[PDB]
Copies of this chain bind each other. A is one copy, B any other.
Amino acid sequence: KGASAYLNFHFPTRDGKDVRLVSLGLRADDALHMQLQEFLTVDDKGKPLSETAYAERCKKLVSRLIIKLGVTRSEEERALDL
């Protein structure tokens, strides 16, 4: 029951449209998520952002993202040295 907000990461595709790479559900119990939600909705005066200010802030987020490729351990490597 009820709705929630999502942070979606889109990337341009060869057909000139885009594709949604990953989605992040912003849980109300997560102070990071709510800081993100507030940042992308409200202008630190209560006032909902103009689409311009929203698009600017989305861009500003992007500009500070860091992308890292990570490989997890295999079960063989993670097994306890027993």
Contact = CB atoms under 8 A, between A and B. Distances in A.
A71 to B, nearest CB: 5
Interface of A: 1-12, 18-19, 21-24, 32, 37, 40-41, 54, 58, 61-75, 77
A24 B21 contact: yes
- Give the oligomeric copy count: 2
A60 to B, nearest CB: 10
A69 B11 contact: no
Contacts of A72: 3-6
A19 B1 CA distance: 30
A61 B9 CA distance: 11
A5 B70 contact: yes
